[PDB]
Design an enzyme around this catalytic site. Structure first.
Site, mmCIF file in Angstrom:
data_model
loop_
_atom_site.group_PDB
_atom_site.id
_atom_site.type_symbol
_atom_site.label_atom_id
_atom_site.label_comp_id
_atom_site.label_asym_id
_atom_site.label_seq_id
_atom_site.Cartn_x
_atom_site.Cartn_y
_atom_site.Cartn_z
ATOM 1 N N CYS A 15 1.243 -1.281 0.300
ATOM 2 C CA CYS A 15 0.168 0.234 0.069
ATOM 3 C C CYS A 15 1.125 1.219 0.610
ATOM 4 O O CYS A 15 1.642 1.103 0.587
ATOM 5 C CB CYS A 15 -0.595 -0.554 1.070
ATOM 6 S SG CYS A 15 -1.940 1.821 1.122
ATOM 7 N N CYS A 18 -0.023 3.594 3.821
ATOM 8 C CA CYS A 18 0.325 3.072 5.223
ATOM 9 C C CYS A 18 1.451 2.073 5.129
ATOM 10 O O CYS A 18 1.970 1.491 5.852
ATOM 11 C CB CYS A 18 -1.274 2.366 5.280
ATOM 12 S SG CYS A 18 -1.723 0.754 4.474
ATOM 13 N N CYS A 29 -9.157 -6.298 -11.655
ATOM 14 C CA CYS A 29 -8.879 -5.345 -12.310
ATOM 15 C C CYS A 29 -7.068 -4.238 -11.799
ATOM 16 O O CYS A 29 -6.690 -4.905 -11.024
ATOM 17 C CB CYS A 29 -10.384 -4.210 -12.077
ATOM 18 S SG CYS A 29 -10.703 -3.330 -10.900
ATOM 19 N N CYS A 37 -6.160 0.376 5.103
ATOM 20 C CA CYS A 37 -6.443 2.039 5.367
ATOM 21 C C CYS A 37 -7.320 2.097 5.023
ATOM 22 O O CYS A 37 -7.619 3.525 4.508
ATOM 23 C CB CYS A 37 -5.136 2.633 5.551
ATOM 24 S SG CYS A 37 -4.678 2.817 3.646
ATOM 25 N N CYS A 42 -3.851 2.336 -8.133
ATOM 26 C CA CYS A 42 -3.481 1.619 -8.911
ATOM 27 C C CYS A 42 -2.498 0.482 -9.023
ATOM 28 O O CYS A 42 -0.940 0.837 -8.972
ATOM 29 C CB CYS A 42 -2.701 3.044 -10.326
ATOM 30 S SG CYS A 42 -3.108 1.811 -11.858
ATOM 31 N N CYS A 60 -9.225 18.961 -14.932
ATOM 32 C CA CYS A 60 -8.693 17.247 -15.210
ATOM 33 C C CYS A 60 -10.382 16.414 -15.283
ATOM 34 O O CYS A 60 -11.440 16.640 -15.115
ATOM 35 C CB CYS A 60 -8.455 16.681 -13.462
ATOM 36 S SG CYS A 60 -9.014 14.147 -13.832
ATOM 37 N N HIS A 69 -4.412 9.457 -12.403
ATOM 38 C CA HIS A 69 -3.347 10.033 -13.022
ATOM 39 C C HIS A 69 -2.082 9.056 -13.350
ATOM 40 O O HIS A 69 -1.795 8.984 -12.417
ATOM 41 C CB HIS A 69 -3.027 11.962 -12.448
ATOM 42 C CG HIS A 69 -4.184 12.231 -12.509
ATOM 43 N ND1 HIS A 69 -4.850 13.211 -13.361
ATOM 44 C CD2 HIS A 69 -4.871 12.706 -11.424
ATOM 45 C CE1 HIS A 69 -5.338 14.053 -13.256
ATOM 46 N NE2 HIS A 69 -5.782 13.950 -11.928
HETATM 47 ZN ZN LIG Z 1 -12.068 -1.977 -11.368
HETATM 48 ZN ZN LIG Z 2 -7.915 14.095 -11.691
HETATM 49 ZN ZN LIG Z 3 -2.860 1.202 3.103
HETATM 50 ZN ZN LIG Z 4 -1.433 3.625 -13.138
#
Ligand SMILES: [Zn+2]
Ligand SMILES: [Zn+2]
Ligand SMILES: [Zn+2]
Ligand SMILES: [Zn+2]
Ligand SMILES: [Zn+2]
Lengths: 216, 76
Positions: A15, A18, A29, A37, A42, A60, A69
């Site tokens: 992560c 954390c 996905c 947390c 991504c 954005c 992003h």
């Molecule tokens: Zn997804």
């Molecule tokens: Zn954005």
């Molecule tokens: Zn975390």
């Molecule tokens: Zn990415």
């Protein structure tokens, strides 16, 4: 060398908020939610996912939606490349990659692609080989997993996909990261235009700052 | 969640979405990725024309569904 083996073995994922360490379960996905947390991020680039209307960047254009992003070298973009083009980026930079399975491989029951996924089945999850078709020259992996493998090498070596961009791709990346729609200057010929866009993108927009890299 | 967008023809591109994404959101994601203005995009799913204000879930669009992208042409 051992790039394929490293892709195929069980990987860790941390992560980015954390720092908790997990074992990666493939099959889902790109939207990861930390169970400790609740941070959403991504799996390709470790940047944050923002839910609708809570993103920080003006302006954005994808602001009214769940989005992150992503840098230009995130799998988010590179999964759309052909295997041939991903191979070219590696080849251009003297990075070796597999096209055939390990000399001492093992038969996949049913399949098909050997990558182990945690798949959805009636009433829960089940660990099972991907099983998708395995084209010649894709090292015993399916099209999608072969591309992920090549991307793992691209990212490990900090290779810049922009080096292979056509002018339209440079223009699109420019609009995305520099929030300006570029155009040729007066007196600027098409090759000089492309060179300028590549130059500006490289010096102004870094590759993914949270993508783990080979440190040697 | 991954969905695919294919033209005719036509590279297939991928998008990361959620079922509650509006069609407008999807067009913006295609613009980000491919540079095509939303006003030039017509998206179709199972022969059904996708309307801006509706969501993917409205059309029963799920993981790895394929949408078709056709370019729109308007007169001057
Ligand atoms: Zn997804
Ligand atoms: Zn954005
Ligand atoms: Zn975390
Ligand atoms: Zn990415
Ligand atoms: Zn596979």
């Amino acid at each position: 060398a051992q790039g394929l083996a490293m892709y195929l073995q069980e990987n860790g994922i941390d992560c980015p908020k954390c720092k908790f360490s997990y074992a990666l379960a493939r099959g889902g996905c790109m939207h990861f939610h930390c169970t400790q947390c609740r941070h959403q991020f991504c799996s390709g680039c470790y940047n944050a996912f923002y839910a609708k209307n809570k993103c920080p960047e003006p302006n954005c254009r994808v602001k009214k939606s769940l989005h992150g992003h992503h840098p230009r070298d995130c799998l988010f973009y590179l999964r759309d490349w052909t295997a041939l083009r991903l191979q070219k980026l590696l080849q251009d930079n003297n990075v070796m990659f597999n096209t055939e399975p390990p000399a001492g491989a093992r038969a996949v029951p049913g399949g098909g692609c050997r990558v182990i996924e945690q798949k959805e089945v009636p009433n829960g999850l089940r660990d099972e080989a991907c099983g998708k078709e395995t084209p010649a020259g894709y090292a015993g992996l399916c099209q999608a997993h072969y591309k992920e493998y090549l991307v793992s090498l691209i990212n490990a070596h900090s290779l810049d996909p922009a080096t292979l961009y056509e002018v339209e791709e440079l223009e699109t990346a420019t609009e995305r990261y520099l929030h300006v729609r570029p155009q040729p200057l007066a007196g600027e010929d098409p090759p000089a235009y492309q060179a300028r866009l590549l130059q500006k993108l490289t010096e102004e927009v870094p590759l993914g700052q949270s993508i783990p890299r080979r440190r040697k | 969640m991954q969905i695919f967008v294919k033209t005719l023809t036509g590279k297939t591109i991928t998008l990361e979405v959620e079922p509650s994404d509006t069609i407008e959101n999807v067009k913006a994601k295609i613009q980000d990725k491919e540079g095509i203005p939303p006003d030039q995009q017509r998206l179709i799913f199972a022969g059904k024309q996708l309307e801006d204000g509706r969501t993917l879930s409205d059309y029963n669009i799920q993981k790895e569904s394929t949408l078709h992208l056709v370019l729109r042409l308007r007169g001057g």
